[PDB]
């Protein structure tokens, strides 16, 4: 998407907070001034942390953004960016943003994505699947409450995956089973009580992990597998003393 002629900044970027951010990036004098299409091309990255941004509308017009960093109270229509295949890096930190349908389907290039708590309190089916090159996935603090089986299944080059700070109570079987290259996985600060037998079974290139601060069900006939894995691997950041039972502390023999 683009522009025929000169034009005022504020006509492209109706979000007042966004327009201000764009002007600073463009070495503007104000918000009023018209901008050439080439100027939009010049900017390759955007980094803002204002509470007053509610829309990146007009984000689409600048194709050569490779790197987007945004934090705010609320973000309303990240639809503007569903068309940027030039963005390798996307960091979104907001109290709520709204996941359109298929938003991620066209940014094949980006390798690192950090998301935020969305409307549905969950991740929509097939959210990430167009995302092959993505190597880093931050879901920390998204407040997610469940997981859609196969959500991660198309994410092979996935170096790491942060699921800390959500309200997950269980993990779908073979949720992790499609990432050969995963090195570090964080599952701390959730509501896990137990994990699917064999969840971590295919996690070879896996170096570090976090398990503390989940309410694990410590009854004898289930968690033995989990205990065995902990006893039989050393990627446990914070040290296996960390993860703990209801009533007890460490996990333990039995």
């Amino acid at each position: 998407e683009t522009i025929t002629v000169s034009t005022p900044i504020k006509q492209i970027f109706p979000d007042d907070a966004f327009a201000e951010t764009i002007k600073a990036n463009l070495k503007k004098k104000s918000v009023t001034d018209a901008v050439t299409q080439n100027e939009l091309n010049s900017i390759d990255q955007i980094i803002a942390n204002n509470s007053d941004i509610k829309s990146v509308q007009g984000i689409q017009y600048l194709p050569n953004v490779r790197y987007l960093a945004l934090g705010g109270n609320k973000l309303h229509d990240i639809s503007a960016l569903k068309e940027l295949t030039n963005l390798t890096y996307l960091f979104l930190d907001f109290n709520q943003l709204q996941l359109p349908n298929g938003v991620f389907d066209k940014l094949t290039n980006l390798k690192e994505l950090y998301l935020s708590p969305n409307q549905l309190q969950s991740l929509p089916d097939g959210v990430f699947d167009k995302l092959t090159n993505l190597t880093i996935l931050g879901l920390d603090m998204n407040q997610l409450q469940s997981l859609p089986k196969g959500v991660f299944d198309k994410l092979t080059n996935l170096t790491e995956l942060d699921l800390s700070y959500n309200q997950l109570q269980s993990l779908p079987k073979g949720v992790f089973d499609k990432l050969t290259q995963l090195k570090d996985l964080s599952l701390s600060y959730n509501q896990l009580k137990s994990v699917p037998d064999g969840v971590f079974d295919r996690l070879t290139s896996l170096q570090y992990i976090w398990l503390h601060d989940n309410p694990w069900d410590c009854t004898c006939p289930g968690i033995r597998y989990l205990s065995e894995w902990i006893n039989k691997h050393s990627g446990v950041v914070g040290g296996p003393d960390s993860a703990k039972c209801s009533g007890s502390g460490k996990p333990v023999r039995s």
């Binding site: 942390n49 509470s51 934090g71 109270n73 960091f91 109290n95 950090y114 700070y165």
Partner: protein, 72 residues
């Protein structure tokens, strides 16, 4: 082992620049209210807030002169 440094050291363990600014902001000392109260007036995102609150708590304890050991 100077406070500025030490906080610099806590800070540095946050990767993202916007989050890093948050932690410096929480460090910066407020007089009439707690890390908690201070955080309410804020409208930034979840990462920011967790960073800003955590930085403020650590810096205040450091001001308290409690050993990292005694540090929660």
């Amino acid at each position: 082992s100077t406070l500025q440094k030490k906080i610099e050291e806590i800070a540095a363990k946050y990767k993202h620049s916007v989050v890093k600014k948050c932690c410096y902001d929480g460090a910066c000392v407020n007089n009439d209210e707690t890390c908690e109260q201070r955080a309410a007036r804020i409208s930034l995102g979840p990462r920011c807030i967790k960073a800003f609150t955590e930085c403020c708590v650590v810096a205040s304890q450091l001001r308290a002169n409690i050993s990292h050991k005694d540090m929660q």
